[model samples]
Target: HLTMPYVMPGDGEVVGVGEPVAIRFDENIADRGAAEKAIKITTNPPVEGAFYWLNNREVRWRPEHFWKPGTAVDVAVNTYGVDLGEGMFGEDNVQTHFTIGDEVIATADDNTKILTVRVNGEVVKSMPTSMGKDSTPTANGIYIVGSRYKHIIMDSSTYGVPVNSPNGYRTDVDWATQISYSGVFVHSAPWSVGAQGHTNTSHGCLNVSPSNAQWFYDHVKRGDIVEVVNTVGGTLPGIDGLGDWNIPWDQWRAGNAKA
Candidate 1:
C-alpha cells in the first residue's frame, strides 16, 4: 500500500500567487497515469494547468499563470484501493484547501541594487539590496516564496560548496525568507549595509537591511512572487524553488505528465 507523508501550504493556510499544488507519496507509483487521474485540484475560478512529475515520488499541479488573488484551491486525492501498478495501491486518500492572498510581488533589479515590493500592484515599500556577486550571480526569474525563517545558519557545504574554502564560510542570518531551493533568500546582512544600495556583493542572496529583511519575512508567506532581473546566473530551473512560472503558457498547457 502507498502512503502520503505531507503536502505543501498546509490546509486552510493563505498563500501567495506562485504556489503549486503538490502531492508526495511514500513510495514511487509506477502507474503515474492512474495516480495523476486520481488526484484532482479544483479552483473556485477555473484555471488551465497540468501535472508534472518532478520525480517518481513527487508530482505537482500548477496553473499556466500565477493564480489570481482571492482564488480558492481545493485538492482531493482519492487513490485508495486504486490500482497504481507494480502491485502498489493507495493506502490513504487526503485533501487540502488553501486560499490565495493579495498579489505581493517583490522585484529585485541587480543593476540598481534595489528591491521594490508591490502589494496588489501598488508599491508598498522599496529597499536597498546587495545581491549576488559576479562569479556567484543570483538567477533571473520569478521565484516563488517558500519558507520563512526567523533565523538560520548557512553552510556552503550543504549546496555543494565547501564551508572551509576560500569563497565559502558558514554564517548566521536573521529574517531569512527562502525563494529558491538552491539556497537563495532575502535576508538580513548588517555587514553589507554599505554595499546594499551600491553594489552586488553577496553569495547569491539578496542582502537587505535588518529591519527591511524582518519586515519582508514577517509580511509575506509561501507562494509570493520574488522577481530577479539583470542577473547572469540564468533562469531558475523548474525543480528549483517554484520555477513553475518560468514555463511558458503554451508549453505549460501542452502537458508534462509522464503518464
Candidate 2:
C-alpha cells in the first residue's frame, strides 16, 4: 500500500520563489508510470512545469521559469487503492499548498569584476567585486542562493589543499552567502581590497567589501537566483549547487527517467 506519504512546502507554508514541490512515498513502487500519473500540481494562474522522479519513492515538480512573487501552488496525489505494480497499492491520498514570496536575482560578471542585484526585475544595487584568478577561475551558471552565514571559517584544506600548501588558507569571513557546492561564495574579503573591482585574485569566490557584502547578505533569501557569467572556468552543473535553473526547460523535462 502507499502507506504514509508526505509533501514538502507543507500545507499553509510560504516559501521562496525558487522552491520546488516534492512528495515522498513511504514505500517503493514498481510502476512509476502509473504512480506519476496519479500526482497533480495546480498553480493559481497556472505555470508551465514538469515532474521528475528523484528516486523510487520521491518525486519533484519545478516550473520552467522561476515562480512569480505571491503565486500559490497546490499539490495532490489521489492514488488511493490504485495499483502501483509489484502487488503494491496506494493506501491514501495526500494534498498540500504553498505560496511564493519575493523574487530576488543577482548577476555577477567575472570579466567586469562587478555584481548587480535585482528585485522583481528591477535593478537595485551594483557593486565592485573580485573573482578567481586564472588558475582557479569561478564557474559561470545560474545558481540558487542556498545558505546565509553571518560568520564562517574558510579553509582550503576542505577542498583538498594541504594546510602547508602555498595556496592554503584558513580564514574567517562575515556576511557570506553560498552560491555553489564547490565552495564558491559571495562574501566579504577584506584582504582582497586592492584587487576588488580591478582584477580577479580570489580563490574562486565573488569578493566584495565588508559593508557591501553585509548589505547583500541582509537582502538575500533562500532560493534567490545567482547567475555568474564570463568566467574562465566552465559553467556550473545541475547536480552541483542549486544550478537547476541553468538547465534548459526541454533538457530538464527530458531528464525524467520515466519519459
Candidate 3:
C-alpha cells in the first residue's frame, strides 16, 4: 500500500503583495527523481519559484519575493510507488486550504534579533530564538516558516557541535517545534532556560516553550512569517546553504535559477 498521500496547505490563500508565500513538507523523500516527481504546485500567473532541501526529511518551495497579492496557490505531493532510498515512505495524503486575508502584518528585524509575526496588526505569536554563532551567524533577511515539525530529532552535529563533547551535547534530542534551518529551531530547551531570553546562546535556533512551541506548530501555516536579523551573513547563497536568508534581496534574487 502507498505509505501516504501528499497533503497540500489548506490554510494559505492569496500571495499577498510584498508578502512572501511558501509550502513545506515533512516526508523525507530526498531522492532527486522522487523529490521532483513526488511534489507538485499549481498557481495562477505561475510565479518564478524554487525548492530547497532543509534536511534529510524536509523540503520547502517559495517564490523569490512576496507573491502577487490576490493570486491563488496550490501544492500537492505524491510518493506512491516511489523508492525513498532509505526504506522510508511519505506521510499520508493531507489537503487543506487557507486564504490570504485582506490584512498584511509581517516584519523582520535582524538588528534586534527579533522576528514579529502578526495577523491584521494583532501579534499572533512573538517568540525568542538564537542565531548562529559569531563566526556562522544566522541569515538576516525575510523568511517564512517553510517547514514545521511538532516533534523531531534535533541533532547538535547539524551545527558541528559534537555530541558528548565539552562544547557540545551529543545526544538525540526531540524538538517540539522547528521553523528554520541553520540548526536554529523554536524547540524546547529546558536545559537552557537560564541562557534563553537572557542570551543568544543557541547554536542558532529560536527557542520557545514546549507548550508554546506545540501551539505554534499546530497554528503555524506554510506561509507564516519567519525572519532572522542582526547578522552579517548572506542569504541562502547556494542550494546547500541553510542560512541564506541573511543575504540582501538583490543578492538573494541573484541566487535564483532565473537570475
Candidate 4:
C-alpha cells in the first residue's frame, strides 16, 4: 500500500501568496501518472496550475503565478484502494483546505544592505540590515518564510559546523523567521548593529536590530515570501524548504527524473 507522508499548508492553515501545494509519500510511486490523476486541486475563482514531481515520492502543484492574496485552495488526494501494479495500492485519501493571506513579501537587498517589507504591495516597514559577509555570502533566491520563533538558539553544530569552531556559535536571538533549510533566517543580531546598512557581516543570516526582528516576527508567518537579492551567493536549489518557486515552470513540468 502507499505510504503517505504529509501535506503542505495543512487544513485551516493560512499561507502567503507564493505557497504551493505539496504532497509527500514515504515510499516511491511506480505509476506516477496514475497517482497524479488521483489528486485534485481546486482554487476558488479558478486559476491555472499543474503538478510536478521533485521525485517519485514527492509531488507539488503551483499556479501559473504567485497566488492571489485571499485565494481559497482545496486539495483532495483520493488514491485510497487504487491498485497500481507491483502489488502496491494507495493506502488512503488526504484532503485539506487552506487560504492565502495578504501579500507579505520582504526583500533583503545585499547591495543596499536593507530589508524592505511590504503588505499587499504597500511598503510597511524598512530596516537597515546586515547580510552574509564576503567569506560566507547568503544564497540569492526566493524564500518561503517557514517557522517563526520568539526565542531560539543558533547552533551551527546542528547543521555541520561545530560551535567550538571559529565560524560557529550557540547564540540566542530574540526573534527568528526561518526562510530556508540551509540554516538561514531573518533574525536579530544586536552585535552586528555597527555593521548594519554599511557592511555584510553575518554567517549567511539577514540581521536586524532586536526590535526590528521582533516586528518581522509578528508580521510574517509560514509560507510567506522573503527573497535575498544581489548576493554573491548563488541561487538556492529548489529542494531547499519551499524553494520550489526557483524551478522554471518548463523544467518543473517535465519528467526529467524517474522513480
Candidate 5:
C-alpha cells in the first residue's frame, strides 16, 4: 500500500506570516533534481522565492523576504508518472494552499540590551533583555519565530555542548520562542534578571523576565520575524533555520541549486 505524501500548512490551512511551505515524502527520493522539478509553488501576484532540499524526504520553500501580508500561496507536488531514480517512482501527487496572516516582527538589539515588538509597522511594546555574553555572542540577522513552548527543558548538550562541562547547563525554562535552530531563543531567564537590561550574560539567547517572556510568547506565532542586531558573532544562515529573511532576494535566488 502506498501512503500519500503529506504537506504542511495542509490544504486550505491559514498560517502565520513567518511560516514556510513544507512537503514530506513517504520515502526518500533517489534523484534530488528530478524531485525538485516535480514540485511547484505559486503565490498570488507572484513573489521571489526558492525551494530548498532539506533532505531526501523533505523540502521547503520560502520567499526571499518576509511574505507580503494578506497574500495567498499554493503548493503542488506532481509526482505521478515521474521517475525519482533508482527504480523508484513518485507514489502520488499532492496539493496545498495557505494564506498569510498579519505581519508581526520582533527586534532585539544586543547593543542596547532591549527588544522591540511590532505589528503591521506599529510598535507594540519594548522590554529589557539579556543577550549572549562576549565569549558566546548572539548571532546578528533576521530569523523567523519557528516554534513556541510554554515550558521546556533546555539542555546544552542538545547543541553539541557537554552537559557536565563548566559552561554547560540543563535547565527548565518558560515561554520559550525558538528564533533559530541553533538553540537560540527569546525566553524567560529569571536568574539573569538584574543583567537583563545592563549586560550580555547568556549563552546566545535573548533572555527576558518571566512576565515579559510570557507576553511576547502570547503574541508570537510561527513565521513571525525576529531580527537580532549588533552582536559580535556571525550572521545567521538562510538555510537550516528560518533565517531566510536575512538573504537578499538576488542571493536567495542565486543560492538555489536549480538556478
Candidate 6:
C-alpha cells in the first residue's frame, strides 16, 4: 500500500544574494490562499514584492522594485499547519537569509561564445560555450537564470535531429551547474577541460570544468543574472532567461506576470 507522507517545507541552508527565494513542500499546494499562508517574506525595509506561482509545484517571489544591492532579505516557510493539495499538510519549517550584494550586474557583449557574467558590475566567472548551429544558433542579447537543475540528460532527438546526423551525438553532460534555461548551461565537461581558453565547441551550453562548473553552480542562486549576447550566426528567440539566447530586460521581466 502507498502511504501519503505529510507535506514538509524543504527549507534548509542560507539564502543567497539576489536569489529568487523558493519554498517547496512534499505535496502539491496550488492556488494563492494556500501559498500565501505557507510562505512569508520579511525584508529589512519591506519592499513591495509578490509571489507568482510558476506551476502547481513551485512559487517564485520578487520585489516590484528589484532587490537593491546591499539590501537585507529574509524568507520564512511556515508550513506547520498549511493545507496541501490532497488532505495532506506540511509539518516542517524553512528559513533563509540573504543580502543584496554590490556585485550583481547586467552584462552584455560579443567577444566569446558566451557574452558575460557580472554581478553588480563585477565579472565573477566567464567561459566559452556552444550555441545552436550557425543556421539555427542560440539567440543572443540578454537573459537571466530562469530555472536550475543540478543534474539532467540531453538528447538530439529533442532538437529534431537524427542521432547519426550532424549535431546528433547523444550523451549525458553534467548540467549540474547552470543558471539559464535556454539550454545554455555552465556545466562540467571533462571532455573539453582542455578547450576552455582555446576553443568554442558544444551544442549550446557554456562549457566549464566539473570543478569550476560546480563552483559557478554553487555561487549563483536562483534569480541571479545571466546576460548573453553576440552569437551573430544563430537566430534565436528570447524566452525570459532560458528560451532564446538574447531578449531585452524589459521583455524578460514582463514574462513574469507574478513579478
Best by TM-score: 1
Full candidate order by lDDT, most accurate first: 1, 4, 2, 5, 6, 3
TM-score (C-alpha) between model 6 and the true structure: 0.60
Which residue segments of model 4 deviate by more than 4 Å?
84-86, 255-259
Candidate 4 vs candidate 5: the TM-score winner is 4
Cα deviation in Å at residue 125, candidate 3?
2.9
Looking at model 3, which ten-residue stretch has the lowest summed lDDT?
A: 14-23
In order, what lDDT does every prediction score?
Answer: 0.87, 0.82, 0.51, 0.86, 0.82, 0.54
**Model 3 regions lying over 4 Å from their true place:** 1-42, 45-64, 68-70, 74-114, 133-136, 158-161, 164-167, 171-175, 180-182, 232-259
Estimate, for each residue in 60-80, the C-alpha lDDT of model 5 and write its tens digit: 778766788888998888887
Query: Over the stretch 58-162, how does candidate 6's per-residue lDDT look in tens digits?
Result: 556665444676667777777665665456666666676766654443343445544355666667666554444445444554344544566777666765677
Which candidate has the top score in lDDT?
A: 1
* Residues 1-259 of candidate 2: C-alpha lDDT, one tens digit per residue: 4455687767887766777777778887677777778888899878888876656777667888889888899989888887888888888898998888888888898777789998888989998899988888888888878789999998888888976797777889999998877788899988888888889998888999998899989998777788888989888876563666777788777656453
Indicate the residue-level lDDT of 213 in model 4: 96
Instruction: Score candidate 4 by lDDT.
Output: 0.86
Models 1 onward score TM values of 0.95, 0.80, 0.54, 0.93, 0.89, 0.60
Off by over 4 Å in 6: 1-17, 106-114, 122-130, 139-167, 170-176, 181-183, 187-201, 207-223, 230-259
Q: Give the clashing residue pairs of candidate 5, or none.
A: 18-223, 19-223
**Total colliding residue pairs, candidate 6:** 14
When summed lDDT is taken over every stretch of 10 residues in candidate 5, the lowest stretch is 250-259
Off by over 4 Å in 2: 1-13, 22-35, 53-59, 76-96, 156-169
- TM-score attained by model 1: 0.95
Using lDDT as the yardstick, the better of models 1 and 2 is 1
Instruction: Please rank every candidate by TM-score, starting with the best.
Output: 1, 4, 5, 2, 6, 3
Residues 1-259, candidate 3, lDDT per residue (tens digit)?
Answer: 2245434344544322333323344454445446545667666767775565444544445566655545566665655466755676654544444344333334435455444566655887665544455665555554545456645666677677787665565434444434444454556655665554445665555655565566666665544555555566666433332333444445544433211
